[PDB]
Design an enzyme around this catalytic site. Structure first.
Site, PDB file in Angstrom:
ATOM      1  N   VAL A  18       0.865  -1.113   0.000  1.00 56.95           N
ATOM      2  CA  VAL A  18       0.000   0.000   0.000  1.00 56.95           C
ATOM      3  C   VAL A  18       0.941   1.211   0.000  1.00 56.95           C
ATOM      4  O   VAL A  18       0.771   2.177  -0.743  1.00 56.95           O
ATOM      5  CB  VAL A  18      -0.965  -0.017   1.224  1.00 56.95           C
ATOM      6  CG1 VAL A  18      -1.843   1.167   1.150  1.00 56.95           C
ATOM      7  CG2 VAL A  18      -1.792  -1.229   1.152  1.00 56.95           C
ATOM      8  N   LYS A  21       2.240   2.051  -3.311  1.00 59.15           N
ATOM      9  CA  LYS A  21       1.286   2.752  -4.122  1.00 59.15           C
ATOM     10  C   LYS A  21       1.056   4.136  -3.592  1.00 59.15           C
ATOM     11  O   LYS A  21       0.913   5.000  -4.375  1.00 59.15           O
ATOM     12  CB  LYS A  21      -0.028   2.035  -4.199  1.00 59.15           C
ATOM     13  CG  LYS A  21      -0.069   0.711  -4.937  1.00 59.15           C
ATOM     14  CD  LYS A  21      -1.536   0.190  -4.947  1.00 59.15           C
ATOM     15  CE  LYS A  21      -1.693  -1.275  -4.571  1.00 59.15           C
ATOM     16  NZ  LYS A  21      -3.011  -1.792  -5.081  1.00 59.15           N
ATOM     17  N   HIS A  98       3.486   3.158   5.823  1.00 60.39           N
ATOM     18  CA  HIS A  98       2.287   2.911   6.646  1.00 60.39           C
ATOM     19  C   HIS A  98       2.536   1.826   7.655  1.00 60.39           C
ATOM     20  O   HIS A  98       3.321   0.926   7.361  1.00 60.39           O
ATOM     21  CB  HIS A  98       1.086   2.524   5.798  1.00 60.39           C
ATOM     22  CG  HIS A  98       0.810   3.444   4.626  1.00 60.39           C
ATOM     23  ND1 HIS A  98       0.497   4.790   4.770  1.00 60.39           N
ATOM     24  CD2 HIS A  98       0.626   3.150   3.307  1.00 60.39           C
ATOM     25  CE1 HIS A  98       0.159   5.291   3.593  1.00 60.39           C
ATOM     26  NE2 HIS A  98       0.285   4.323   2.678  1.00 60.39           N
ATOM     27  N   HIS A 243      -7.720  -2.882   0.313  1.00 58.45           N
ATOM     28  CA  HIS A 243      -6.375  -3.277  -0.152  1.00 58.45           C
ATOM     29  C   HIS A 243      -6.128  -4.777  -0.101  1.00 58.45           C
ATOM     30  O   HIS A 243      -5.108  -5.274  -0.562  1.00 58.45           O
ATOM     31  CB  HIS A 243      -5.230  -2.606   0.645  1.00 58.45           C
ATOM     32  CG  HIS A 243      -5.252  -1.129   0.526  1.00 58.45           C
ATOM     33  ND1 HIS A 243      -4.932  -0.483  -0.645  1.00 58.45           N
ATOM     34  CD2 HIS A 243      -5.664  -0.168   1.394  1.00 58.45           C
ATOM     35  CE1 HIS A 243      -5.134   0.813  -0.502  1.00 58.45           C
ATOM     36  NE2 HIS A 243      -5.543   1.030   0.735  1.00 58.45           N
ATOM     37  N   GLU A 249      -8.143  -1.398  -7.495  1.00 62.17           N
ATOM     38  CA  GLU A 249      -8.493  -0.249  -8.307  1.00 62.17           C
ATOM     39  C   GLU A 249      -9.763  -0.458  -9.108  1.00 62.17           C
ATOM     40  O   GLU A 249     -10.407   0.458  -9.572  1.00 62.17           O
ATOM     41  CB  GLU A 249      -7.330   0.350  -9.146  1.00 62.17           C
ATOM     42  CG  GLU A 249      -6.120  -0.491  -9.548  1.00 62.17           C
ATOM     43  CD  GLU A 249      -5.653  -1.485  -8.495  1.00 62.17           C
ATOM     44  OE1 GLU A 249      -6.216  -2.606  -8.455  1.00 62.17           O
ATOM     45  OE2 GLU A 249      -4.681  -1.139  -7.754  1.00 62.17           O
ATOM     46  N   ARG A 289      -6.334  10.585   9.110  1.00 62.66           N
ATOM     47  CA  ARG A 289      -7.697  10.282   8.735  1.00 62.66           C
ATOM     48  C   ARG A 289      -8.436   9.698   9.961  1.00 62.66           C
ATOM     49  O   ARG A 289      -8.042   8.652  10.533  1.00 62.66           O
ATOM     50  CB  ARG A 289      -7.785   9.386   7.511  1.00 62.66           C
ATOM     51  CG  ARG A 289      -9.204   9.393   6.922  1.00 62.66           C
ATOM     52  CD  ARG A 289      -9.383   8.418   5.814  1.00 62.66           C
ATOM     53  NE  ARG A 289      -9.459   7.100   6.420  1.00 62.66           N
ATOM     54  CZ  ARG A 289      -8.515   6.139   6.235  1.00 62.66           C
ATOM     55  NH1 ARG A 289      -7.492   6.403   5.436  1.00 62.66           N
ATOM     56  NH2 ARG A 289      -8.604   4.961   6.847  1.00 62.66           N
ATOM     57  N   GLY A 310      -3.712   6.258   3.552  1.00 65.38           N
ATOM     58  CA  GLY A 310      -3.333   5.861   2.234  1.00 65.38           C
ATOM     59  C   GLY A 310      -3.458   7.027   1.244  1.00 65.38           C
ATOM     60  O   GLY A 310      -4.415   7.800   1.373  1.00 65.38           O
ATOM     61  N   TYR A 314      -7.131   4.958  -4.939  1.00 64.97           N
ATOM     62  CA  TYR A 314      -8.507   4.667  -4.623  1.00 64.97           C
ATOM     63  C   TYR A 314      -8.681   4.891  -3.049  1.00 64.97           C
ATOM     64  O   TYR A 314      -9.628   4.397  -2.379  1.00 64.97           O
ATOM     65  CB  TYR A 314      -8.834   3.260  -5.130  1.00 64.97           C
ATOM     66  CG  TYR A 314      -7.803   2.217  -4.743  1.00 64.97           C
ATOM     67  CD1 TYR A 314      -6.714   1.979  -5.521  1.00 64.97           C
ATOM     68  CD2 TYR A 314      -7.950   1.482  -3.562  1.00 64.97           C
ATOM     69  CE1 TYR A 314      -5.715   1.010  -5.153  1.00 64.97           C
ATOM     70  CE2 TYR A 314      -6.982   0.555  -3.161  1.00 64.97           C
ATOM     71  CZ  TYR A 314      -5.878   0.308  -3.966  1.00 64.97           C
ATOM     72  OH  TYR A 314      -4.959  -0.608  -3.545  1.00 64.97           O
TER      73      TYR A 314
HETATM   74 MG   LIG Z   1      -9.481   1.005   9.351  1.00 68.48          MG
END
Ligand SMILES: [Mg+2]
Ligand SMILES: Nc1ncnc2c1ncn2[C@@H]1O[C@H](COP(=O)(O)OP(=O)(O)O)[C@@H](O)[C@H]1O
Ligand SMILES: Nc1ncnc2c1ncn2[C@@H]1O[C@H](COP(=O)(O)OP(=O)(O)O)[C@@H](O)[C@H]1O
Ligand SMILES: Nc1ncnc2c1ncn2[C@@H]1O[C@H](COP(=O)(O)OP(=O)(O)O)[C@@H](O)[C@H]1O
Ligand SMILES: Nc1ncnc2c1ncn2[C@@H]1O[C@H](COP(=O)(O)OP(=O)(O)O)[C@@H](O)[C@H]1O
Ligand SMILES: C[C@@H](C[P@@](=O)(OP(=O)(O)O)[C@@H](C)N)C(=O)O
Ligand SMILES: C[C@@H](C[P@@](=O)(OP(=O)(O)O)[C@@H](C)N)C(=O)O
Ligand SMILES: C[C@@H](C[P@@](=O)(OP(=O)(O)O)[C@@H](C)N)C(=O)O
Ligand SMILES: C[C@@H](C[P@@](=O)(OP(=O)(O)O)[C@@H](C)N)C(=O)O
Ligand SMILES: [Mg+2]
Ligand SMILES: [Mg+2]
Ligand SMILES: [Mg+2]
Ligand SMILES: [Mg+2]
Ligand SMILES: [Mg+2]
Ligand SMILES: [Mg+2]
Ligand SMILES: [Mg+2]
Lengths: 340, 341, 340, 341
Positions: A18, A21, A98, A243, A249, A289, A310, A314
């Site tokens: 991830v 990306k 991440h 993911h 995607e 987030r 992320g 997407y």
């Molecule tokens: Mg979560």
């Protein structure tokens, strides 16, 4: 003179991909007239390399040994391009790692030693948002509703018949849904517990929260918070795990995400204000987030807070941002300027 | 070979001087039959150097530009010799930094990235034990009593008359009593907020907690805990701030410490058990010193937890272990072995 | 030189008597070596009088016409002791009015015109805490759970069959439980609605909140909040309405109040922190009593915020305060000093 | 008798000068056959006086030390004549103060205590319409769109780069554009925060809302509402700040206002209906001017609500009523009658 931005990605972590990306979209949007990006890939086995750009074939003969140094006078990388390690200055650092190594305060610790300004959350707030248990504890103390949960230590042996189903089982410190399971009945508790333990020696068991997932992307420091549009995940079954899907995607097979959320402007504002306090309670800065559950009663329960969210194509956050009028390039720029 | 041990000390931190002292002791007791120590000092201003040894004036034209790298294959240091950085392998890392950068998970962050085994607490327990208000929140959630307190952030201007005196003012994230002060009257509040604000943009006002300070040295990883003898501080006035005093090796002016504490065997064991519960509840490992208050009512209240305690020659932690029969050569070895486990 | 404290009590308001009792305890505790109290009784019909002390026979031949003036240079009272109105300076004003006239921003409005420093909440926060609907609206916006409720305007005619029982019916702006009813079934909705309307032309209907009442006494301005011990009301039936009972000083017939609350130190801290945010969300200062519901799930719902709380001898706030080590005299003093 | 009407004006408020102007008009149109006006001016510094009449230099050796008393039996004023305060009865109160003390429920607070009937909004709707952030919270709860905004309190130091420009900076509780400014670039943010901070310790950063300003004059008590013709402001740059301009009676430099607005009859009615919903949702009475933004998308967004609108000779409110056929003598009378209802 372009501002030299070290962009770290990959990492010794299950969210490695991830992360790659996330990095490929940052690379494709940062403004190169203003910034000169230095791409630091970290392999899965923890080796640091400077490369040309992030991509799925980022590891290549052209890359070379490159670490971030802890030394404040160097304020930069120690790079081996020729036969020798040389010091290269960095103005600012934007890590896109991440999970493990990246959002758990580890990379923040090196940034702190280095004195190099960096994007987002500091050490203690990354450590608090990373360990979901630690996050519920601080969140309860501020008065934020959270799921009821039990910390299952390495040596513990929960007795299944004692819970009320369904439940969610999960690593205390992973992301991207690695090791997470909706557990519907008692004889699946163990299998779930063992699976969550492939990712952390300490796992949690949560009461199921009813309703749907409403997310809030936040940008800023303490004095002024900018939030994107609220998003909503509705699941036809199972859990959110885009993911983990094949060909993510192409769209999820079990989940539908709406942005803005299909809720009045009063309900969305409410979710945003809740997200702002969660954020302040945890001591976050830069970005995070904030993910929540919105119960049918209409009350808002915390799910988790993802500090380095992320940025894939997407991904939830850039999407919430673009919908509020901030596209990726401008996003990247404000994050970097906030670091500076 | 001997086990190569990188020993970090000094630091860009107001406890820099206490740290060099801590390192001096460790360098004088580590067993060099078993271990090969590698001394990295960090200046007050963040510069890393390899030197022959920790001392009051350790920076010398001998001292090496040398950093511990986050790279797993390097598993050690980038050392400048002949104007070129080279890789030197390390087996284990023992940080003797205190406070900023040292007990706040910063150093632990680099240690995690590097994969070198290291002594002491991980990043999250270091972060939670460093921000005193974070420690109270987590200890409270686990059932440990704590002082009532108020978080005062950078732009706050609290009205002094609000509080009941006396009150303790302090930085959220410091140590060695930098920035701490017992304030007995409202008119002294401002002075103390500002003085604390030198060491942290965030500062704490705490309820004076009554009683005496009883501490406990803890050793081990999750579960198998060893503890030293309980120590105990009586103060004739002011606060315990031994590192801040004139020539502390000669003793304190206002404080007397007794070890073992002058309490029943059952009260001592009870404090050691409380100490143990605090340690696990915070997710500590390696070591820590758990400092408490014993009230007259016999209630135990958390003061704070010092994740990398001082190792100077008049420090609480080594002295508690030593009273339990573990002197410094051995403690050092137990710590490194624990890091190797 | 003693600080001249105008202490207002009584008022043109149904809580008039609670107010007189609040005042009799303030009088009996304020330190008279430091303060020189001026007692301004307001009759039930809205007449202002300076008297000797608060008591149930406060209205007496010795009192005389005395109002607070709006004029900033007077900064005081216009008193008629002889045949003439004279101006008497006031250093600070502590109103002990409750409800209408007193906590609804009305008296705060005169204080503001006068420029005389005063104890507690300003205009907008008194107006927001007074109108329970207004309080839920601001509280929801900050992310604080509240009961579900319906505003019943003067001309409305709720249809009973539509609610789910039980419910609580009540004036939008009263206190002391005037006009409040637990409503158990539909044919009592009206009677309840009409009763609540004896106290306000706009009344509210609330969903019942389950659990028990936990209260938090708060002291201070924004930067530093001092809370007393958490209290708990358990009811054998009916609603809390101690001031409506016969002989309230003898103890309630349906309610038992414990202080500190019988809850862990973690649960009590949590209630306090929630109370602090409610307080900050409403923009309160000086003091207020924050009342909450603690649901068996353990989640905290707002009930109401009382800005000028009862100081009677069987009152919640002084009691919560004394239990935290602040007795009435010291309480009174800090409130006055906070006004100054 | 004629109805005795106490007319308050001036004020300890930065809109003091606009208020004296507002009062000048009212004194020139109220019908003195029906009404006996009693002029109380309040100085910039809070001093109350009875004068013969509102004017630019109304304070005179004629002007009376005179306050409106909170006492219900007095039902009127304490007037100093012959060095002694005496009671003069009043029938109704009409405050022409604007902003601080005047639209923030302060004056309403005294009016409530006195029992004198008074024109306009009660205390809570005045408080909610005065603090712009309070108005957005309540309008939003009722389904009215509002600008996105950020509350910036006294000790906050927001980083400018955070916002998307342009942005509007303003005091939370002011009027007449004191402290308002369109900030088009981050480097101008600080200047604007500080300038707003002159009129309130609390200030707002708002999302620039696009479109044109469409306003609506509302008249009535709960339900029975009359509205004027919708007005409409087009700006060539900057912001509407007519009271701040050189000689505003001569017109604006950057603003043109049209009434009725140049919009379809259906769009005008729709704005008047939105106006009406805002008015009830806020619990207003007597009067107010509801100011809105009409976006290209045709969406109506609340700007703000001015509970005691200006009554100067170039003011929006009287002019909207007048375009609907209600000129000032009449409006004044409708307002007083409404206060008497
Ligand atoms: Mg979560
Ligand atoms: N307690 C819960 N109640 C309802 N759904 C849950 C719960 N915990 C996890 N989930 C579901 O699983 C998904 C991911 O788990 P999460 O806690 O968010 O971990 P991760 O960081 O791996 O996303 C959530 O998005 C949600 O669908
Ligand atoms: N709340 C408190 N009640 C009583 N004494 C206190 C309190 N807080 C600090 N002290 C005193 O001040 C000293 C130093 O403060 P401490 O909290 O231990 O921070 P640090 O030691 O990390 O600098 C303590 O050793 C004790 O003597
Ligand atoms: N929605 C509710 N759910 C449960 N109890 C309620 C509710 N509303 C009112 N009550 C009960 O009635 C009592 C008083 O009503 P309250 O809203 O507190 O008005 P007042 O200001 O008159 O106290 C509360 O103390 C509680 O016992
Ligand atoms: N968010 C906004 N979007 C567009 N224009 C604005 C906005 N806020 C203020 N303005 C402009 O600034 C003027 C004055 O601000 P306003 O909010 O009406 O406060 P006040 O008029 O009470 O001083 C408006 O008339 C309008 O021209
Ligand atoms: C779906 C989500 C993953 P991540 O941000 O958060 P958690 O999986 O929820 C990385 N860690 C995203 O890319 O937006
Ligand atoms: C007195 C003490 C210091 P430190 O361990 O703890 P704090 O000062 O409490 C460094 N940080 C010791 O050396 O034992
Ligand atoms: C019971 C309570 C009444 P009051 O404070 O609050 P509400 O009745 O809850 C006055 N208004 C008290 O005196 O503590
Ligand atoms: C332009 C205006 C001022 P005011 O009514 O409204 P704000 O300036 O918007 C006073 N307060 C008028 O006189 O109409
Ligand atoms: Mg996650
Ligand atoms: Mg310490
Ligand atoms: Mg200490
Ligand atoms: Mg009440
Ligand atoms: Mg109540
Ligand atoms: Mg205005
Ligand atoms: Mg305006």
């Amino acid at each position: 003179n372009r501002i030299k931005v070290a962009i770290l990605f990959g990492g010794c972590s299950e969210e490695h991909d991830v992360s790659v990306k996330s990095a490929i979209e940052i690379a494709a949007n940062i403004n190169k007239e203003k910034y000169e990006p230095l791409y630091i890939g970290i392999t899965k086995s923890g080796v640091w390399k400077m490369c040309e750009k992030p991509c799925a074939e980022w590891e290549n003969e052209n890359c070379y040994s490159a670490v971030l140094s802890p030394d404040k006078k160097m304020h930069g990388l120690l790079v081996k391009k020729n036969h020798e390690y040389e010091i290269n200055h960095v103005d600012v650092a934007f890590s896109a790692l991440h999970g493990k190594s990246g959002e758990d305060g580890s990379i923040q610790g090196l940034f702190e030693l280095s004195g190099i300004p960096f994007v987002g959350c500091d050490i203690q707030s990354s450590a608090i948002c990373m360990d979901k248990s630690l996050t519920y504890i601080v969140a309860k103390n501020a008065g934020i509703a959270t799921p009821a949960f039990w910390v299952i230590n390495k040596d513990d042996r929960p007795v299944a018949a004692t819970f009320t189903y369904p439940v969610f089982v999960k690593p205390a410190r992973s992301g991207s849904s690695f090791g997470v399971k909706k557990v519907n009945s008692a004889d699946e508790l163990d299998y779930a517990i063992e699976s969550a333990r492939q990712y952390d020696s300490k796992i949690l068991i949560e009461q199921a929260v009813s309703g749907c997932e409403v997310g809030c992307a936040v940008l800023g420091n303490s004095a002024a918070l900018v939030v994107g549009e609220v998003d909503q995940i509705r699941l036809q079954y199972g859990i959110f795990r885009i993911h983990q899907e094949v060909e993510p995607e192409k769209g999820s097979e079990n989940a539908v995400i709406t942005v803005p959320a299909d809720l009045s402007a009063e309900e969305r504002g409410r979710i945003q204000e809740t997200v702002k306090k969660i954020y302040k309670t945890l001591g976050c800065r830069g970005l995070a987030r904030v993910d929540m559950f919105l119960q049918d009663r209409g009350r808002i329960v915390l799910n988790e807070v993802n500090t380095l969210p992320g940025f894939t194509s997407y991904s939830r956050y850039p999407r919430m941002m673009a919908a509020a009028g901030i596209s990726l390039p401008e996003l990247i720029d404000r994050l970097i300027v906030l670091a500076l």
